[PDB]
């Protein structure tokens, strides 16, 4: 149980790019002396008479193992002991060897994985390997969770020719008492529960490999946590012995330039739904609130310098954009198509790709829109139009000759420069309820709002701002369309009341917003249920009480101070209380009489 040489592994599946020779050299360079593959092991497109002997050094794959479209006779993974299957091939496979043959049905004969004893997660699949010998004799039950071969091999089970390639059995022969794996059939032979492939003895220090984490020369279910439970305070303190996880290893410090997941693991880069920030002194991954930031070029910029409009051909390129550098221009030709360039008409529903757009730095010029839409719903999340464009007229917002009945620009809070023109929209109401000047950031900005539906005709039809709106007007008739609320709001909706004394989920009010009480707060009958966020601000706990905390269950095994665990029991009033220090697996009541 030591540190081992680590490599990254690949995620290319079945892609070929170069010559078989270049590809083979890439593999050789990658896995050279590699003992632990942090990712996947993809062995593809290796041809006959190529030497893959370096693969003999590989002992662990963290991801999946893919062996496909090879014609080489031998793949010598003789020392591969475990595939953890933390990533899957084809949505379900940790091990997949597929189609290792050419049109002559010649190819992979020898896959002597004589030390492969554990596949932690994932499935196994062998397909179309007409030259593969002996692997059909394997008893996979010993490995996966839920010539002829030597006569000495157990039940005719073997990975190859020799006695040395007889399958080693460490699970299915084990006594009924054993949790996990063994060295022999006796209850004396059982391995520690944390052992992965087999053991050299009964202890955590004896395991051949670890099921979860390796902290030094010991296997553990988890790494020493970064935070601790403090029984005196019922709160969480920093752990001075805490460690982060790096692959299946516990480490005091991440390698460079790695970052730390919320899960406390060391990774090279944060995930796609996340952003990075260093707080505090640690480079951390945090999940994005809303769509992750993404700047895209607008119409008349870069690749779109000679593009008339948003249209069928370019629309999907705005997918996930949150800020547009430059303009968005939408013109009648978008919806008509262009027959001469085979530009199809824009599918109206594709316009909802623009729902992620919160900012446009230039101008928003809308001169056409599908007639069956009643508002500019695609731009319901647009917050700012900066109007910085310097060579395309005076208007930063144009809404011209459309069929809409409301603007629906629910999130719009600033038009920093440029004039606004809203003209010729014969069904359009609500536009005069807005004090446009309050949106402006530049002296003298102007509006030109005319030849829309008449204000008096709108009033007479009931097309007015909702009763729950403030006097600041609205973007449509709904309580979500108000510029601001009469009083309280729940999310983006102006509402007549928060669920203080009645309704579910129960709430409190914070700066005129209805905020949900914590789920552990028990709803009170015609009386408030909480005074603030979280499980310490409840009037009454729904289940158990742990100090100031309303909790779902009492703490049971959590890491405490002095390198100990914390166990608690619940009394008749549902209050949590410390177990006696010597009930190291928990208790049902106070004292030694609590842990018989």
């Amino acid at each position, epitope marked *: 149980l030591e540190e081992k040489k680590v490599c990254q592994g690949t995620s290319n599946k079945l892609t070929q790019l170069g010559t078989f020779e270049d590809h083979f050299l890439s593999l050789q360079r990658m896995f050279n002396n590699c003992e632990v593959v942090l990712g996947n092991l993809e062995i593809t497109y290796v041809q006959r008479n190529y030497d893959l002997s370096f693969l003999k050094t590989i002992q662990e794959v963290a991801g999946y193992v893919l062996i496909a479209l090879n014609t080489v006779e031998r793949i010598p993974l003789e020392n591969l002991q475990i595939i953890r299957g933390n990533m899957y091939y084809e949505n379900s496979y940790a091990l997949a060897v597929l189609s290792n043959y050419d049109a002559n049905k010649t190819g992979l004969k020898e896959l002597p994985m004589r030390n492969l004893q554990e596949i932690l997660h994932g499935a196994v699949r062998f397909s179309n390997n007409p030259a593969l010998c002996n692997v059909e004799s394997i008893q996979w039950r010993d490995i996966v969770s839920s010539q002829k071969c030597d006569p000495s091999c157990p039940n005719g089970s073997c990975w190859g020719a020799g006695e040395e390639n007889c399958q080693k059995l460490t699970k299915i022969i084990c006594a009924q008492q054993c949790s996990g794996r063994c060295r022999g059939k006796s209850p004396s032979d059982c391995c520690h529960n944390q052992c992965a492939a087999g053991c050299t003895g009964p202890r955590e220090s004896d395991c051949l490999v670890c099921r979860k984490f390796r902290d030094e020369a010991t296997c553990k279910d988890t790494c020493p946590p970064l935070m601790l439970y403090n029984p005196t305070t019922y709160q969480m303190d920093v752990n001075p012995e805490g460690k982060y996880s790096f692959g299946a290893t516990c480490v005091k410090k991440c390698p460079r330039n790695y970052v730390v997941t919320d899960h406390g693991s060391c990774v090279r880069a944060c995930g796609a739904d996340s952003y990075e920030m260093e707080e505090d002194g640690v480079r951390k991954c945090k999940k994005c609130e809303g769509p992750c930031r993404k700047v895209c070029n607008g119409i008349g910029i870069g690749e779109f310098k000679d593009s*008339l409009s948003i249209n*069928a051909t370019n629309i999907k390129h705005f997918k996930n954009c949150t800020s547009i550098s430059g303009d968005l221009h939408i*013109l*009648p*030709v978008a919806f*008509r*198509g*262009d*027959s*001469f360039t*085979h*530009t*199809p*008409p824009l599918d109206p529903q594709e316009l909802d790709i623009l729902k992620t757009v919160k900012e446009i730095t230039g101008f928003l010029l809308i001169q056409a829109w599908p007639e069956n839409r009643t508002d500019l719903h695609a731009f319901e999340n647009l917050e700012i139009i900066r109007g910085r464009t310097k060579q395309h007229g005076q208007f930063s917002l144009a809404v011209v000759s459309l069929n809409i009945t409301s603007l629906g620009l629910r999130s719009l809070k600033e038009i920093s420069d440029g004039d606004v023109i809203i003209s010729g929209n014969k069904n359009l109401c609500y536009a005069n309820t807005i004090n446009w000047k309050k949106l402006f950031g530049t002296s003298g900005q102007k509006t030109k709002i005319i030849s829309n539906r008449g204000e008096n005709s709108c009033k007479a039809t009931g097309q007015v701002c909702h009763a729950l709106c403030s006097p600041e007007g609205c973007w449509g008739p709904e309580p979500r369309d108000c510029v601001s609320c009469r009083n309280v709001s729940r999310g983006r909706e102006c509402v007549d009341k928060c669920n203080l004394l009645e309704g579910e989920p129960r709430e409190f009010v914070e700066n005129s917003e209805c905020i949900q009480c914590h789920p552990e707060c028990l709803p009170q009958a015609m009386n408030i249920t909480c005074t603030g966020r979280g499980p310490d601000n409840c009037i009454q706990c729904a289940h158990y009480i742990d100090g100031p905390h309303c909790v779902k269950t009492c703490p049971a095994g959590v890491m405490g101070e002095n390198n100990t665990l914390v166990w608690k029991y619940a009394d008749a009033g549902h209050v949590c209380h410390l177990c006696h220090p010597n009930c190291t697996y928990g208790c049902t009541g106070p004292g030694l009489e609590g842990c018989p």
Partner: antibody
Amino acid sequence: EVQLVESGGGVVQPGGSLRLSCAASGFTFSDYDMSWIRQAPGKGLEWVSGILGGSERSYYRDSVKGRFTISRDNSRKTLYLQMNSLRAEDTAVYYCARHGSPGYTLYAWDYWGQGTTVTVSS
Amino acid sequence: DIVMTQTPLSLPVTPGEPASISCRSNQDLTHSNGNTYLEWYLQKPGQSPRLLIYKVSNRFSGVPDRFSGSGAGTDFTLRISRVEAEDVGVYYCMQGTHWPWTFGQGTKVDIKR
């Protein structure tokens, strides 16, 4: 029904000028791209020019470019081909044709006019 | 321009019998978007041209299944399973894939006697 009725054809000297008209009815004209196609005495069909429904862009066959101008007046549902600097090789029957498949996803033309004849000789 | 070659240029046909017209371009007609804009038009005597087939093998509305098209790349064929007397006229293949769009010279189908 959809109709396309052409006029304006006639006889003209080399270097002279004519203007063809194509009057549309029975559909919303401004929703459709339009083309002119011609057929000389001994040849097949030859595409000459095209324009978008709202005139945002026009297209011309090279041998015609700079001598012909395509245009449209959507308020009168009418398509035009202004022909100047007329050469002998321009003599043909000229058709207007509607791009029935918007954005040419399927096919180039559905409806055609009845044709108008242009003869250029001295 | 893409040259479209029709063979034959003259086709007497016996009514009730099959007929076939070949169209070959001097350049592949597969567009970058994946479609092949190869069309057949028929010009009946005293009438304007009218679309028969589009995208190689699709019959325009109103066109009977006696007409079919096939082919790919640079090689195409119009087939009439049984010719009717009302089918006489001039058939044109047409390419809308590359600029400028072009027609073949036209195959005149008439009556065999």
